[PDB]
Amino acid sequence: GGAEALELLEHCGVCRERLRPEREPRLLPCLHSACSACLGPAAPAAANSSGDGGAAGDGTVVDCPVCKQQCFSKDIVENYFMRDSGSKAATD
Ligand SMILES: [Zn+2]
Ligand SMILES: [Zn+2]
């Protein structure tokens, strides 16, 4: 049992746990794979920072536990490569 996430990375940075089937792994534009659920909180809500005008963040760039900064969300949660997970179970 395990996941072949080695292709892109392995486990999610936010939780630091292997990518399980229900983990729904996703690759960010910063080149960091993480659990989709973990990726949710990654984006800001009702808040912004370093915004020249209007509003910054939330639907656009996402904060990553690695770089904690993004320019665009073109490669953000949406380009899920696949589920390298397989035969994953709590029991042995
Ligand atoms: Zn995670
Ligand atoms: Zn990152």
One-letter amino acid of 23: R
Other beta carbons within 10 angstroms of residue 74's beta carbon come to 9
Ion ligand 2 neighbours, Cβ < 5 Å: 30, 32, 64, 66-67
Ligand whose nearest atom lies closest to the CA of 76:
2
* Experimental technique for the deposited model: NMR
92 Cα–ligand 2 center, Å: 33
Residues 6+ apart with CB under 8 A from 35: 12, 14, 15, 17, 19, 23, 24, 25, 26
Ligand nearest to the Cα of 14, by number:
1
Q: Where in the sequence is the domain holding 20, given as residue range(s)?
A: 1-92
* C-alpha distances in Å from residue 79, one per residue of 13, 69, 82: 17, 18, 9
Question: What are the counts of helices (DSSP H) followed by strands (DSSP E) for the chain?
Answer: 1, 6
∠ CA 85-11-45, nearest 5°, is 110
- Look at the chain and report how many structural domains it folds into: 1
